[PDB]
């Protein structure tokens, strides 16, 4: 229920790494964070998602994005779940998980049976909610799309650009990035008279200010999403 | 604000194709629908998303999914915006757009300046909200993921399975699909004794019930999302 | 719940296709009157004809110290496209701002609003920010913009001459271009006005004189003459 | 306060012609009516308006439009006021005036002080409010424009047309009348392919269905509004 | 507003100008009689206006001002007075409150407008001393209003209550009543003093009013009872 | 309660017994004058009782009953009347409402009890026709109450309004006023008829009251103006 | 409604002796008072009670107790009723009576037709209500018992003793007075070990601290109550 | 707080004789009842009152009146207190006592520390409260006056008479009883013209309708109140 563009609600949460204040803990560090929610511990979809996030941990870290889970179970159950994953899948889960018995945090976030406790909130270093994704409990997230979202948002912010559908493979403008549109007649006229940008109309101007490395990084996330793993973690268990 | 698993709010809406009742109009046809929202007409990120949906229109059709937009502007503005897209980009937008001046519909869906009018609701043929995505106005959606979502939910429904992260490329079980977990000790016991499924624990059993066609179809959506276009519409 | 004549125009910040402004302050600060005229939606035919009429009369409104501001329940982007269309297809540039009111927040504050058909009020506002006249022509009926010019002309003339203005002025059937002395409100004032012999009168409460200049009177008549005359060359043909 | 498109509020009112129910009294007769309001009796702007309306009574009658005044004073004051007008101006006022002391009717109509009791309501034969005009106490109405309004609305209703600004002298389409715009894509396309109307775009189509007589009549109201009267009634007095 | 209560503070518009009640009169040391009417150009009200106007000097003599109230505009009020002066030959000298909307009548608890008929007699402290409510179909007896104010003033200055029908009371004539004792000791001390004529300790009286005051009050009644020599309509 | 309103329905206890107002009088075709008093054994009220008693036959002749109200008990009421008969020599023939608690005074808007002084003149339909509020320090003019009831009955019977100071009005004398026209057509028809003496269409009158009824009203006023030959205190 | 041990409600009241504040008028004099209530003036049971109180006035005076009546009728009625009593029974009523028209005081005291206006309130010199008696309108009080109550309460107060049933003629302990019982175990033990009192148990200790004068005065009230009068006041 | 003339509040109560409904339990027997209240058990003034009532119990019975106590303590305590009284004073307490822990019943009767729980309610066989006495915890009741009250109320009801102050020893009319006064002028006049009654005024008429036995019984209560017991129960 908190909307995109609103500050992440101020709250003290208990995690299996300790007690922290959101969004402050991350804002303090100049870090974005992705909070992802789960109905219960020892559940199979959420376990696959934990492992996906863990395998992408360095990619998130390189981008300056921390990860934090939320599940409606106790801190003790959380730690045992993480032990199970390291033992059986052989993947250590590096990020904290919020213990939310009573569902207090889930309720504060508008996510609450606990089946609906599934929201993902992507929060910037100013503490502002930038994107929210609600995949249901029967459907695993596509974690590489979360990396593409954070990368694209960060480029947008730093370049003062909006990002087209399917970027950096947009069908109209490709890796192009959109100039936020003029909001007055004089501004629109001036933009057109400048001949500064490629343009379809005064409200649809664009350029290509992203570096080749930034474009290639975002593309790599999508390529990874489309690629079948050569070896499956079930196999070497 | 209407949550996953709740019925889509009953409402009569005016579109540039006419007046329709939601979710009834689609439910009565046995169709899913994807409703996608926009702050205003003649805006660039939204235009790019209209074009992406339009180009994938046949793929949604193939799955029995209809598409409907929502923008906080009049039906006259909606028709003009679509004419512009067809004339200047050369892509006809085939789907209806809800005319929501006053923001009544946006407000009813909890989406509401109109910057927050951005939700996507994926609604099944029983009229139930199954997934919702809220990409902000400055960030275009990844329309191929929306196809993967519908394809995976339909398969899950059909096969009585949950779908793992990143399916059909999951790093643990690949294209495997998860058996919904036991909720009693006896049920957990009997499942482990049956030897019916590959398993990591009693709560993590899986199998491979999806056809090659269905798996390759879902992976194709992702492959397309990852491919650099051979030619750009702005050039053409 | 509409604001009435004599009430101050409700305070509000609004987004126009010329930028964000505060009403009535933006105009009060400039010593200008404004005419705010409302529309159910962009790309609509009656409204387009009214925009073009206002635009044609822009110099006339300016000469009276009156600014023009439209209001339509659509976005700023839609507004700019609509104005582009009018300039391209009718060959008339629309010079005035139009408030972008998606959500209908402004229309609602003005008491003009489920469908937006009722979003049609005209508010004539003086340089103190006070609503002086309101006209509510429906969606299916275009305004007579020359009458809006007559209204503002007459109101300013009455303000400055301390006079009321008769029906059909400057062509009133009783007193012609005469203007009415605001009536006495006491017996002593009524008797003194009658004893002074200073005004043409029909009773103590109906006294009048002719203080308007020949040029002010002719300007008012000119508006009505223009309203009555068949256009020389239509814009659709030329 | 009651908006365009709404039914004129049901009310019993006392006039100097007797007690009547609105809008029923007129709806029953298949007549439109113009209700026009006044702060007080024996007031000079209102007296000029009564005389203007009376001089145009035959024009309103020909159109099937009745006239009814409203003023915040008693029925006795109303009758004495009309006597004064007939005697001193030499014009009999033929229409009823609602006696509204206490301002009960003016309040019901959102007009109410008393300076603000100045609303004009133009109401059709179905009892629906079609136009409202609010000229202040210090500014006389243009009665010929009220005639143009009723003529234009009746034509629009009968020809199923919208009426452009300044009709029948619109600067774009002259005496042309507007086809109500298409509200769907298919309707807009069908209209364009049909070649049935003159048009500048799918949403701006027009034709010339008005009779020469009807156009000439509306023009006649405007010509009269514009013309300097040949003789003043103050002189005739 | 009941007897003994201050007259509600209000600013009112009259055909003489805007004034504050009761202050306008209080500040002059004047009593006032406020009299209410449903509408202008009505016949019973017209006869009342003429009766008050003809008695104007008598109210002046007593330091009482007059003020009308009618549910009609100031313009109608002025026309109505003009008509009376022209057709009856009597000038109406007192102000009339213009009460369109009936705001003033409502304030006084008087409010169709048929009920707008209250008379309020207000003393120089601004206190409501008497109220009369004759209906629209029945003209007041204006000489009785004079008797009321004269009697109230005499009662005030002499510290006396006034018997029924004074100065022609059937028990004590022009006698005035001593306000009764409220304690046993006071009642005993009064009976022992022998100061007053009395029928019981609670009914003592004397004759403190001057001949002029008595004859003035009786004159009002004599005038009420007298058939007019000439009629104004003639 | 305002003039023109029905007298409030109530059961009251009087020193003649319990009765329902206004029904007790309505059912007899009687008007009634209810006159109120702060307390028993009070001198102004005693003078008014005697005045009313002396005029009892005049009221009875008009078909008008009398009823007092005082904030004291029925026992006190009977003792007060005994004192009046013994010491003034005048028997009080009318009932007095016993109103301890002041319940009736309160219902009538009359309430220390100094303010309990209202006179209500009520017609045979149970409607309040006139109200007079003389304060406790000022005795009423009872002959004016007779004039009021006589004039109201005449007006009712003759369908006429009554001018100020009737039957000695200074404009029209014993003339009675025709209720004025309320439409233009009616005012015109009235003036065209030439049926009435007239100053204007809204001021028409005639002389339909009998010599007897005019003489009766004039004698009430002559009596008011006349000094009694002998005073009851002198008697005594 | 105000309970024993609670302060007598603060109020200004009008009596036939003047306006006073209660309980302050008596408190400020160091006087107890007995306030006795009546439905109305000129009533027979209340008259018999006024006479009984007036006959015992000196006995109340001896104890420093003032008397004050209350009746729902005006001061004027009260003075007339008192005059009637002195004239017809030959007994002057020396005490004030509160005039309570409209029953304000009676309602404030929780007493309030007016038949229930019958409370007796015995109030001490600190303005505290010490006893309340509610004999109905149809039953006269036993005034000598009221004397016994005040005497016994004052004795109890001055001797720090409770007073047994029927004192000074109690069937267990006669003119004995009761020691307030112990409220702790140690205090109860200490009392038994001291052997200071006659006792039946630790909670029932008594002694004889009243003087012969106090005892015989209390018994005299009862003897008076039981004695047939030698002469009836009716007979002269 | 329930007023004279009002029905005794309907309630179920637990007594040391069992659970009963008031006032129905007594109404159903055609009985008046006297309910008398106490702050606590094992209290000296209340003990003295219980004993006085017990000694007078047959006098109450003969008037068709029953007795019921109320004390803020449990039934067990009630039974123990009554045992103590029989053992140490030698008087059996025959009447029920209401166990009112929590003070629900006292609170319903507007009597409620529990010092204020001292009300006496005299209730007739219609269940109507006829008299209420509020002697404080430090002052025992005069129980013979309670008998006089019931005797006089029953005579009044039966004879249609009001009872003067101090009856049957009233100083104006002695054992006379008062005719309820006229409430109209005509009735007052009729009564005086009849010459039927001894009279001081129309509102003060009386006669002597009570039997010798009833008068002597009432005077016996007052004489017993006045008389010092020849032997004390402490002795």
From Swiss-Prot, chains A, D:
Alphabetical GO biological process terms: cell redox homeostasis; cellular response to hydrogen peroxide; hydrogen peroxide catabolic process
Origin organism lineage: Archaea, Thermoproteota, Thermoprotei, Desulfurococcales, Desulfurococcaceae
Entry protein name: Peroxiredoxin
The protein's assembly and partners: Homodecamer. Pentamer of dimers that assemble into a ring structure.
Keywords (A to Z) from UniProt: Antioxidant, Cytoplasm, Disulfide bond, Oxidoreductase, Peroxidase, Redox-active center
Family membership noted in the UniProt record: Belongs to the peroxiredoxin family. Prx6 subfamily.
Catalytic center residues: 46
Single GO molecular function: thioredoxin peroxidase activity
Disulfide partners: 199-205
Main location: cytoplasm
Organism: Aeropyrum pernix (strain ATCC 700893 / DSM 11879 / JCM 9820 / NBRC 100138 / K1)
From Swiss-Prot, chain C:
GO BP terms, alphabetized: cell redox homeostasis; cellular response to hydrogen peroxide; hydrogen peroxide catabolic process
Protein's cellular compartments: Cytoplasm
Catalytic residue list: 47
InterPro entries: AhpC/TSA, Peroxiredoxin, Peroxiredoxin_AhpC-typ, Peroxiredoxin_C, Peroxiredoxin_TDXH, PRX_1cys, Thioredoxin-like_sf, Thioredoxin_domain
Xref: Pfam families: 1-cysPrx_C, AhpC-TSA
Binding site for substrate: 120
Domain of life: Archaea
The reaction(s) this protein catalyses: a hydroperoxide + [thioredoxin]-dithiol = an alcohol + [thioredoxin]-disulfide + H2O
Domain named Thioredoxin: residues: 3-157
Cystines in this chain: 201-207
Outcome after substituting residue 47 to S: Abolishes enzyme activity
UniProt signal peptide: none
Entry's Gene Ontology molecular function annotations: antioxidant activity; identical protein binding; peroxiredoxin activity; thioredoxin peroxidase activity
Keyword Protein transport among UniProt keywords: no
EC numbers, comma separated: 1.11.1.24
The entry's keywords: Antioxidant, Cytoplasm, Disulfide bond, Oxidoreductase, Peroxidase, Redox-active center
Subunit structure: Homodecamer. Pentamer of dimers that assemble into a ring structure.
Family: Belongs to the peroxiredoxin family. Prx6 subfamily.
Function: Thiol-specific peroxidase that catalyzes the reduction of hydrogen peroxide and organic hydroperoxides to water and alcohols, respectively. Plays a role in cell protection against oxidative stress by detoxifying peroxides.
Protein name per its UniProtKB record: Peroxiredoxin
Organism expressing this protein natively: Aeropyrum pernix (strain ATCC 700893 / DSM 11879 / JCM 9820 / NBRC 100138 / K1)
Swiss-Prot record, chain F:
Location of the Thioredoxin domain: 1-154
Positions that bind substrate: 117
Annotated EC: 1.11.1.24
Gene Ontology molecular function, alphabetical: antioxidant activity; identical protein binding; peroxiredoxin activity; thioredoxin peroxidase activity
Catalysed transformations (reactions): a hydroperoxide + [thioredoxin]-dithiol = an alcohol + [thioredoxin]-disulfide + H2O
Compartments reported by the entry: Cytoplasm
Gene Ontology biological-process entries: cell redox homeostasis; cellular response to hydrogen peroxide; hydrogen peroxide catabolic process
GO cellular component: a single term: cytosol
Disulfide bond positions: 198-204
Active site positions: 45
Enzyme class: oxidoreductase
Alphabetically ordered keywords of this record: Antioxidant, Cytoplasm, Disulfide bond, Oxidoreductase, Peroxidase, Redox-active center
InterPro entries associated with the record: AhpC/TSA, Peroxiredoxin, Peroxiredoxin_AhpC-typ, Peroxiredoxin_C, Peroxiredoxin_TDXH, PRX_1cys, Thioredoxin-like_sf, Thioredoxin_domain
SUPFAM superfamilies for the chain: Thioredoxin-like
Pfam families noted in UniProt: 1-cysPrx_C (PF10417), AhpC-TSA (PF00578)
Induction summary: Up-regulated by hydrogen peroxide (at protein level).
Similarity comment text for this entry: Belongs to the peroxiredoxin family. Prx6 subfamily.
Cited function: Thiol-specific peroxidase that catalyzes the reduction of hydrogen peroxide and organic hydroperoxides to water and alcohols, respectively. Plays a role in cell protection against oxidative stress by detoxifying peroxides.
Subunit-structure text: Homodecamer. Pentamer of dimers that assemble into a ring structure.
Miscellaneous: The active site is a conserved redox-active cysteine residue, the peroxidatic cysteine (C(P)), which makes the nucleophilic attack on the peroxide substrate. The peroxide oxidizes the C(P)-SH to cysteine sulfenic acid (C(P)-SOH), which then reacts with another cysteine residue, the resolving cysteine (C(R)), to form a disulfide bridge. The disulfide is subsequently reduced by an appropriate electron donor to complete the catalytic cycle.
Protein name, per record: Peroxiredoxin
Organism, scientific name: Aeropyrum pernix (strain ATCC 700893 / DSM 11879 / JCM 9820 / NBRC 100138 / K1)
């Amino acid at each position: 229920i908190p909307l995109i563009g609103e500050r992440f609600p101020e709250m003290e949460v208990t995690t299996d790494h300790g007690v922290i204040k959101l969004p402050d803990h991350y804002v303090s560090q100049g870090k974005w964070f992705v909070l992802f929610s789960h109905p219960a511990d020892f559940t199979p979809v959420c376990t696959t998602e934990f492992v996906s996030f863990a395998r992408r941990y360095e990619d998130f870290q390189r981008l300056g994005v921390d990860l934090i889970g939320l599940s409606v179970d106790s801190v003790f159950s959380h730690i045992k779940w993480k032990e199970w994953i390291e033992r059986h899948i052989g993947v250590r889960i590096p990020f904290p998980i919020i213990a939310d018995p009573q569902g207090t945090v889930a309720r504060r976030l508008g996510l609450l049976a606990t089946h609906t406790v599934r929201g993902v909130f992507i929060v910037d270093a100013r503490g502002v909610i930038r994107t929210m994704l609600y995949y249901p409990m029967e459907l695993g997230r596509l974690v590489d799309e979360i990396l593409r979202i954070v990368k694209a948002l960060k480029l947008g912010d730093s370049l003062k650009r909006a990002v087209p559908a399917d970027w950096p493979n947009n069908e109209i403008i490709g890796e192009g990035l959109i100039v936020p549109p003029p909001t007055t007649e004089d501004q629109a006229r001036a933009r057109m008279e400048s001949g500064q940008y490629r343009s379809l109309d005064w409200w649809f101007c664009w350029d290509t200010p992203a570096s080749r490395d930034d474009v290639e990084e975002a593309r790599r996330y999508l390529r990874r999403a489309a690629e079948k793993p050569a070896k499956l973690l079930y196999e070497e268990a």
